[PDB]
């Protein structure tokens, strides 16, 4: 999935982690929107 | 858990949903430790 593949990858790159898949969840939630995520944790 | 209603009831009112559960599973991988999660998301 190219999509996980580049959101989780470019969020890792910001300095967020994936401890117990929580970003995973996030990101999937928001369809791996980077942008949607980032708003929800109020970046 | 008591500790993840309280964490997770004052994280809402900072404005953080809990959709898809990502919230609860950060709080549960940090302890319920508030300061441990908004280190994590960068807050």
Redesign the interface.
């Known amino acids: 999935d190219p999509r996980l593949i580049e959101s989780l990858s470019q969020m890792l790159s910001?300095?967020?982690?994936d401890?117990?898949?929580?970003?995973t969840?996030?990101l999937?939630?928001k369809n791996y929107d980077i942008g949607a995520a980032l708003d929800?944790?109020?970046?």
Do not use: V
């Open positions: 910001m300095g967020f982690s401890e117990g898949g929580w970003l969840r996030l999937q939630t929800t944790i109020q970046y």
